[PDB]
Amino acid sequence: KTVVVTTILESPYVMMKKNHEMLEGNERYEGYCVDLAAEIAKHCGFKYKLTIVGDGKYGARDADTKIWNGMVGELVYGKADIAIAPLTITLVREEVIDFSKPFMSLGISIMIKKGTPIESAEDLSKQTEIAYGTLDSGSTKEFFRRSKIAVFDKMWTYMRSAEPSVFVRTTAEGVARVRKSKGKYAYLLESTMNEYIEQRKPCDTMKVGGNLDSKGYGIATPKGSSLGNAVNLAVLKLNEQGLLDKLKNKWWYDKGEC
Amino acid sequence: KTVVVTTILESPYVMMKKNHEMLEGNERYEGYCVDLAAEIAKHCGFKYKLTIVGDGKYGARDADTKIWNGMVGELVYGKADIAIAPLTITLVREEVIDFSKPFMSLGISIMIKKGTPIESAEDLSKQTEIAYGTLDSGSTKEFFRRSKIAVFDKMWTYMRSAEPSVFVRTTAEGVARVRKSKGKYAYLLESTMNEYIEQRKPCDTMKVGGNLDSKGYGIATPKGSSLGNAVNLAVLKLNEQGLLDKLKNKWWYDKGEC
Ligand SMILES: N[C@@H](Cc1onc(O)c1Br)C(=O)O
Numbered sequence: 132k133t134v135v136v137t138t139i140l141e142s143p144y145v146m147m148k149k150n151h152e153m154l155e156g157n158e159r160y161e162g163y164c165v166d167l168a169a170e171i172a173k174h175c176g177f178k179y180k181l182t183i184v185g186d187g188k189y190g191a192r193d194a195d196t197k198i199w200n201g202m203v204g205e206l207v208y209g210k211a212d213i214a215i216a217p218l219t220i221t222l223v224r225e226e227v228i229d230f231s232k233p234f235m236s237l238g239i240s241i242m243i244k245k246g247t248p249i250e251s252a253e254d255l256s257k258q259t260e261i262a263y264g265t266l267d268s269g270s271t272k273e274f275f276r277r278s279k280i281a282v283f284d285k286m287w288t289y290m291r292s293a294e295p296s297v298f299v300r301t302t303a304e305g306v307a308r309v310r311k312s313k314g315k316y317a318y319l320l321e322s323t324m325n326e327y328i329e330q331r332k333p334c335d336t337m338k339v340g341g342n343l344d345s346k347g348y349g350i351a352t353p354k355g356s357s358l359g360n361a362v363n364l365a366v367l368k369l370n371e372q373g374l375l376d377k378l379k380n381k382w383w384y385d386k387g388e389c
Numbered sequence: 390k391t392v393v394v395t396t397i398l399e400s401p402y403v404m405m406k407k408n409h410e411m412l413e414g415n416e417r418y419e420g421y422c423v424d425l426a427a428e429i430a431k432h433c434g435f436k437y438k439l440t441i442v443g444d445g446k447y448g449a450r451d452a453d454t455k456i457w458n459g460m461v462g463e464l465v466y467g468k469a470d471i472a473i474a475p476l477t478i479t480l481v482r483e484e485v486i487d488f489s490k491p492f493m494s495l496g497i498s499i500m501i502k503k504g505t506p507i508e509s510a511e512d513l514s515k516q517t518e519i520a521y522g523t524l525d526s527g528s529t530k531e532f533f534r535r536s537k538i539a540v541f542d543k544m545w546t547y548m549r550s551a552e553p554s555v556f557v558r559t560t561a562e563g564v565a566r567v568r569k570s571k572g573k574y575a576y577l578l579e580s581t582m583n584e585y586i587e588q589r590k591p592c593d594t595m596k597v598g599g600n601l602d603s604k605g606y607g608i609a610t611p612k613g614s615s616l617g618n619a620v621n622l623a624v625l626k627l628n629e630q631g632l633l634d635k636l637k638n639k640w641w642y643d644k645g646e647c
């Protein structure tokens with residue numbers, strides 16, 4: 132039957148076409164993951180319906196209720212058959228859902244307003260003039276919360292108690308904050324999103340320093356789903372064919388505005 | 390039996406004494422509402438236990454689940470017997486819980502960093518250079534969300550879509566934001582909290598313009614609770630005895646630091 136795909140509005144993975152109100156179904160969206168879903172579906176031989184995750188979250192488990200939210204939750208509770216989005220492969224998630232090998236590699240990075248005197252995470256941790264934060268949910272926030280590494284521990288300690296809050300609801304908000312804070316706010320996010328934004332007008336942001344870690348995004352399916360095998364092979368095939376690199380260039384650099 | 394009082398950490402209504410770790414029970418807290426609870430209990434002849442609302446919220450109903458959160462929720466679901474805090478009497482709340490006549494009068498107001506060229510709500514609505522917001526929950530946010538008054542409608546329209554978010558988690562955060570934004574952020578909050586903060590170091594904030602509305606805080610009890618009658622009479626008695634005004638002066642001006 133028609134496969135239900137859960138995904139999330141995150142540029143340039145999935146975005147509403149400017150003229151979406153005049154369109155219907157899958158045609159309403161565009162982006163790297165929209166193109167990827169089409170390729171995966173073709174190689175696995177299934178028809179699908181793109182749906183945007185109800186709560187706009189990636190996926191975490193509430194420590195008290197033990198309930199999973201976000202795209203991970205939609206898979207865990209059977210609300211969706213597959214997640215095709217910039218969903219980071221992590222230990223906690225790997226335990227409850229299946230993941231294809233990575234379709235994109237990335238790492239946590241620093242985004243600054245051009246001119247900000249910051250070149251690394253160490254730089255940020257050793258000062259207070261420039262505030263810094265992460266998304267209010269997801270693997271980056273979790274990276275800092277769980278890190279036992281001195282420098283990252285120091286940063287988390289500062290972030291968790293910083294006032295006003297240094298956390299944002301969406302990537303768009305973090306970017307807006309960096310752009311409007313006159314260099315007094317730096318944003319910690321995944322290298323992939325950082326690199327995309329660096330090529331977007333008004334071209335006033337920059338990725339600085341090396342990535343804090345090395346990981347990847349994977350296509351997710353409910354644990355034990357018979358669709359997992361084919362999907363994983365499709366990702367490997369698409370990568371080996373150079374299609375994934377082609378898609379990355381298409382949505383990141385081919386039409387960079389900077 | 391011992392009455393369970395739900396309240397909230399909001400200065401100067403209820404605050405943790407500096408040395409709370411060395412104290413136990415009700416002795417751990419201090420403030421206007423702590424003193425008020427003692428007076429109400431004495432006049433109604435009951436023993437009580439102060440408890441801080443689990444979710445740190447005042448009280449709203451989720452439009453989807455219809456579940457009440459905050460102090461209102463604790464009363465509605467029988468987790469607490471009475472709420473003694475700066476809980477605003479509103480139509481939606483009055484329908485599900487009982488309220489004593491007001492023990493304090495107030496209205497929505499504007500807090501600015503001294504020197505900010507803003508004298509009214511109209512001023513704020515007609516410009517964009519200075520951002521402004523409210524608590525991310527409670528009667529003030531709701532006032533703007535539901536207002537059909539042109540000026541407030543205009544302000545809500547701007548606030549709801551402003552990026553980054555102009556909403557804060559606690560009063561303390563809104564104050565910190567006003568103080569650290571060099572006049573580029575104004576905070577909308579209740580006159581009572583505004584007046585208290587204006588007398589606190591570093592004495593860099595000011596209440597401007599007249600209040601946007603006129604309302605009051607009431608002591609709340611589960612609907613139909615036999616404790617409601619006595620509590621209401623106690624509030625009226627304490628007010629007529631001048632005790633409420635005495636308490637206001639004690640926690641607002643007697644030890645003002647400005
Ligand atoms: N890919 C992450 C989400 C995320 O993590 N950090 C960010 O800035 C974003 Br967007 C995840 O799967 O949680």
Ligand SMILES: N[C@@H](Cc1onc(O)c1Br)C(=O)O
Nearest residue numbers: 447476477527528529578579
């Ligand atoms: N008293 C209000 C809470 C509140 O509403 N606006 C604020 O700034 C605060 Br604190 C309520 O009962 O919701």
